[PDB]
Amino acid sequence: PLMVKVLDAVRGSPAINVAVHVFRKAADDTWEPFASGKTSESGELHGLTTEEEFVEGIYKVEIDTKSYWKALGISPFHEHAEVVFTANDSGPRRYTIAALLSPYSYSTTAVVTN
Amino acid sequence: PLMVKVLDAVRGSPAINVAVHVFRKAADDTWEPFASGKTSESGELHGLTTEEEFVEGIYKVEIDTKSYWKALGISPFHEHAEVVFTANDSGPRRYTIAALLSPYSYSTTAVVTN
Amino acid sequence: PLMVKVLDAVRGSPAINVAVHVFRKAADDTWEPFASGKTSESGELHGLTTEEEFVEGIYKVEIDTKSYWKALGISPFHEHAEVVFTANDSGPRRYTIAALLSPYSYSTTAVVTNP
Amino acid sequence: PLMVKVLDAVRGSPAINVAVHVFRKAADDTWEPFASGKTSESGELHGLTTEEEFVEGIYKVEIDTKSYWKALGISPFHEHAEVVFTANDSGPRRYTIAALLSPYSYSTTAVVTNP
Numbered sequence: 001p002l003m004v005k006v007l008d009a010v011r012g013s014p015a016i017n018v019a020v021h022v023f024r025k026a027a028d029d030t031w032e033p034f035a036s037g038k039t040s041e042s043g044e045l046h047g048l049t050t051e052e053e054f055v056e057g058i059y060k061v062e063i064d065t066k067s068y069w070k071a072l073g074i075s076p077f078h079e080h081a082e083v084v085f086t087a088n089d090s091g092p093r094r095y096t097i098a099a100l101l102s103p104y105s106y107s108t109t110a111v112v113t114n
Numbered sequence: 115p116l117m118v119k120v121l122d123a124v125r126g127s128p129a130i131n132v133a134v135h136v137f138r139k140a141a142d143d144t145w146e147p148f149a150s151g152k153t154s155e156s157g158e159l160h161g162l163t164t165e166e167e168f169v170e171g172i173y174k175v176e177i178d179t180k181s182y183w184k185a186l187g188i189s190p191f192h193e194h195a196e197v198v199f200t201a202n203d204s205g206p207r208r209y210t211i212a213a214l215l216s217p218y219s220y221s222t223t224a225v226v227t228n
Numbered sequence: 229p230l231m232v233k234v235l236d237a238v239r240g241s242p243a244i245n246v247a248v249h250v251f252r253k254a255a256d257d258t259w260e261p262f263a264s265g266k267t268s269e270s271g272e273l274h275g276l277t278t279e280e281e282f283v284e285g286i287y288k289v290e291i292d293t294k295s296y297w298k299a300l301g302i303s304p305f306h307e308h309a310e311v312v313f314t315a316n317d318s319g320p321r322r323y324t325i326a327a328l329l330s331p332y333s334y335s336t337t338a339v340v341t342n343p
Numbered sequence: 344p345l346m347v348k349v350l351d352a353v354r355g356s357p358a359i360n361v362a363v364h365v366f367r368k369a370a371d372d373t374w375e376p377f378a379s380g381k382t383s384e385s386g387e388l389h390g391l392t393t394e395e396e397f398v399e400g401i402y403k404v405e406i407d408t409k410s411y412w413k414a415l416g417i418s419p420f421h422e423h424a425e426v427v428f429t430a431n432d433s434g435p436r437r438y439t440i441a442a443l444l445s446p447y448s449y450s451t452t453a454v455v456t457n458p
């Protein structure tokens with residue numbers, strides 16, 4: 001039900017081998033680790049969770065943009081890119097979180113479908 | 115070698131049934147019709163051209179954003195979104211032109227891969 | 229009534245010295261030159277037109293992004309970024325056309341105000 | 344030395360009355376409140392800090408986008424837009440953090456200048 005897609009606006013390419021960490025907000029308002037991985041050669045990270053586990057709640061997707069840019073020898077602005085949202089059962093069932101990265105900027109969108 | 119992907123930033127969805135026209139710049143500097151279609155239920159338009167036909171040159175991809183927004187009952191700013199680029203044989207072989215649409219704004223990127 | 233602002237997403241800076249050409253669609257459906265200029269050290273281009281001259285019409289703002297990137301040593305994807313819109317069709321408005329540039333991407337927005 | 348600018352991509356306008364909270368990472372690795380305010384009728388938030396107070400550190404600018412959209416009748420995707428960055432680590436700089444908002448998307452950039 002959750003996929004993350006990361007693109008590079010400098011090179012016009014997928015952003016490959018980017019670390020992504022997903023957290024779920026706990027009852028005490030802290031962020032508990034939920035899922036993680038590294039983007040593939042297509043800039044995608046699949047397999048993070050299952051329908052059973054991905055219950056309604058507040059989630060944070062953290063994309064390690066700084067390390068990505070540093071590996072390319074480029075000085076970036078942000079420590080990371082953060083996407084924070086509520087999963088809602090009454091909306092469509094599949095969430096794609098997409099991010100388009102530049103050294104001093106990023107764009108993010110959600111594509112939520114059935 | 116050419117795919118167009120259109121997303122809706124208001125609804126968080128693919129932008130479905132959007133008209134897309136591709137033109138190739140002619141020797142006399144006019145834009146000659148090249149390919150066209152309507153985005154699918156996934157916001158994608160595949161099958162526009164072939165490797166044989168998609169020779170090096172300057173291309174324009176015109177996305178009919180105004181009609182899209184009007185069909186949703188939303189007043190938009192732009193007449194259309196235009197993406198103009200050179201196809202180059204020495205770069206990667208497959209071009210995805212992606213657009214992320216809002217009523218008064220849009221984002222576009224190119225994902226060029228082998 | 230028409231201002232253009234250009235930012236560089238690689239440098240985190242205004243995009244300075246960017247050429248901008250504005251056209252207006254004529255009665256015969258061709259794109260007539262309307263005005264032109266270059267962005268300043270703030271990434272802004274002011275003074276393109278006047279409220280008298282900026283009548284209703286369909287306008288195209290062409291931002292010459294390719295030349296900008298090439299001069300930074302980047303061979304960019306796009307030839308230019310074009311922004312096409314109807315202006316002043318409910319009376320005079322002020323338009324800011326903003327663009328944020330990367331070598332293989334850009335975003336553009338408009339801020340439209342009624343004086 | 345720190346300004347926040349917020350634009351609305353649906354309306355083509357400044358995003359007015361947007362709450363913004365700035366935090367700074369403390370020695371113990373927690374996010375300490377640093378400053379806060381709301382965007383003006385221009386979509387800008389000035390006066391958050393001073394060059395004396397805005398020392399080197401890791402800062403988080405939280406833009407309360409959800410509340411903004413809900414008040415326009417749109418149930419948006421994100422809880423907020425957060426911008427996290429190291430500041431002033433090569434001496435004082437001026438930072439503009441800009442955000443362009445849609446219900447299911449945003450973009451953000453920084454403009455960093457050396458006075």
Ligand SMILES: Cc1cc(-c2nc3ccccc3o2)cc(C)c1O
Pocket residue numbers: 005007098099100107108109119210212213214221222223225333
């Ligand atoms: C211009 C743009 C494209 C995308 C985009 N998301 C995509 C997903 C699959 C294939 C191509 C894609 O392009 C995402 C964002 C946040 C953007 O600002």
Ligand SMILES: Cc1cc(-c2nc3ccccc3o2)cc(C)c1O
Pocket residue numbers: 233324326327328335336337348350441442443450451452
């Ligand atoms: C297209 C765009 C414009 C801006 C923008 N930032 C601006 C600052 C002052 C005036 C107009 C401005 O437009 C910011 C972002 C994150 C964008 O994606």
